[PDB]
Symmetry: C5
Subunit: 120 residues, 5 copies
């Protein structure tokens, strides 16, 4: 069991994207946020964010951004691994969410995406 | 609300892009500007720039550039958050604008774009 | 022969890609993994990973990611060089594998891929 | 007017591209050059270059290259701002030119390219 | 002439690409190699490599790689400038080559590629 990989939404698509610069607390940050759909439906949790200088995992901001962007471009089916209730900037969470983006993997069927699932 | 996110234009397209290097004050800078339209119309503020070593927020130059270029390439509907009357180099502002680029988010209808609204 | 180039699969395709951030041991890491098919079949070794701050070769993370993603986009025949039984984090291996990604070369025919062979 | 923005070619296309590594003096450098055309014509200035550790603006090498490469790909109309008589290495300028690349902007018509112009 | 720019092959296509990590001479390195064709033929020197921590010019590894990947993608006509027999790790040379990548420029036709040429 990988820590932080037990909260995911599978077979979703990235259909919105935000990227910006922002001062939060006392730090100048960059952030991006993905908006999620599942076909014509909107998943329960639909907005996941990553911030360069805040979070449980500060590494990989540029790589995650490029990855998100590619998937937004193709619109393909992906699994999004995320972490709930991370951001405490109430201004930020009101506008986007408290969710922190952890990983994105691809799917090869309505039923299977790459990466760990809750056993079983 | 999010500081610096109260000034924006929704459902615009990035129909022109400028990138260049330039000496301003006594500092060597990089800059890019987006030119905007809303359909056949030109909005109030239509030129918005970001500069690597100047501005209210200096971070994110490369990621903001890569992002603007993506949207220039697709011609898709976006919202642009910016900050007014930032640049003090009067040669620059005359040629482009005094507007600093803060964020770019995507839009799915004339109603909804991602990010905070007022 | 070249150290670490004795183990490979030729003429497979990358049909899935994983990228994420993860704490392993005491380190904050990035990883990505390619998932492999050979046509419609799954090959013996089907999952190969690279991690920025762990491995036989920590260099080239961004360039290896960029390369994988490229071949994922095209779906072309590649030959993949890898090192088995590298990762010792048993939560990682169970979720992906213990194979470390060493190199990716291209293929012009079902008979030839670039790079050393045994 | 912006200092280095008086010299430009409008509504051209980048139809050739060079990139390489080169020792000039005792300084190891990278350079890239754009080759220009105007539809079927070739403008007065047809070769323009940027070098990572030489020139009037050493910054923005990676971004300028990515920008030029993109425009090379789409082959679209751009405006090119440059600086003449920069490069002192006579081997380099005989091989390419003495022109330094300052900026690249896009054009939405034959009448308009983004960026300043003269009177 | 430009030092290191007198050895080249014009109007070739990059038809193969290798990228990997590797330990040589007790240093941890990245390398990539382009493989070349000329139409239905294979030029005299068909494999040219660049290595991040070794070579006559160690700069520009990411930019050269990105450049070579682009031309692998398009399969278009290019001129490759290289330097011969630089690599001394015989494992590597037997597997790939001993040639170091110096520059890549684009061609408009079989008469003209960008960059310095011999008379
Ligand atoms: C492209 C450009 O405009 N560059 C100029 C920058 C930018 O306008 C600025 O960084 C964006 O915020 O500004 C430069 O001039 C500033 C500098 O001389 C500082 C010196 O401390 O003063 C600034 O004015 C301040 C002033 O210091 C405060 O007392 C108070 O009045 O606020 C004003 C707000 O501007 C100058 O604008 C710079 O070098 O930083 C000149 C650049 O050409
Ligand atoms: C993602 C992951 O698996 N990370 C683990 C890493 C990687 O397996 C490793 O870096 C791959 O090269 O390994 C970690 O555990 C190693 C660490 O405790 C070191 C301390 O010296 O010991 C390693 O085992 C060695 C051992 O040191 C040798 O004496 C001999 O027994 O061989 C083994 C072979 O590995 C541990 O693998 C790490 O801390 O780097 C744990 C990571 O979670
Ligand atoms: C991929 C690879 O082959 N790496 C080897 C490198 C490169 O071939 C080299 O950098 C090419 O420029 O070479 C290594 O061995 C060199 C090293 O031991 C140095 C010591 O400083 O000597 C080099 O040969 C010199 C020689 O010392 C001089 O007398 C004169 O002949 O110049 C030559 C230049 O080739 C060795 O080639 C290295 O570690 O740098 C071994 C690498 O595996
Ligand atoms: C944290 C969590 O709830 N994870 C669930 C996930 C979400 O609950 C769900 O997506 C909320 O929108 O749902 C998962 O299972 C899904 C199925 O319930 C659905 O019928 O089909 C989906 C694929 O199209 C998906 O398999 C999921 O997204 O994987 C299960 C997961 O643990
Ligand atoms: C190092 C060297 O000899 N370089 C030559 C080059 C090579 O010999 C050749 O590429 C080996 O395959 O050949 C050059 O001239 C070429 C002609 O030999 C060829 O018939 O047509 C080529 C264009 O398709 C080209 O004109 C070259 O590649 O430029 C000359 C170069 O110095
Ligand atoms: C974008 C954001 O929400 N930043 C906030 C962070 C993050 O919530 C945590 O770092 C999450 O781990 O927490 C703070 O206490 C901090 O570190 O300054 C306040 C800050 O404003
Ligand atoms: Ca051509
Ligand atoms: Cl754990
Ligand atoms: Cl979890
Ligand atoms: Cl949400
Ligand atoms: Cl993309
Ligand atoms: Cl304006
Ligand atoms: Cl496997
Ligand atoms: Cl010229
Ligand atoms: Cl074209
Ligand atoms: Cl245009
Ligand atoms: Cl060869």
């Amino acid at each position: 069991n990988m820590a932080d990989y037990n909260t995911y939404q599978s077979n979703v698509q990235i259909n919105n994207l935000s990227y910006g610069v922002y001062r939060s607390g006392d730090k100048e940050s960059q952030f991006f946020c993905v908006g999620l759909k599942r076909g014509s439906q909107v998943p329960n949790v639909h907005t996941i964010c990553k911030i360069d200088v805040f979070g449980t995992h500060k590494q990989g901001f540029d790589n995650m951004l490029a990855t998100a962007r590619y998937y937004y471009a193709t619109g393909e089916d992906v699994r999004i691994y995320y972490k709930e209730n991370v951001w405490t900037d109430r201004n930020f969470t009101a506008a986007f969410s408290g969710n922190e983006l952890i990983a994105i993997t691809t799917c090869t069927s309505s039923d299977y995406c790459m990466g760990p699932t809750l056993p079983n």
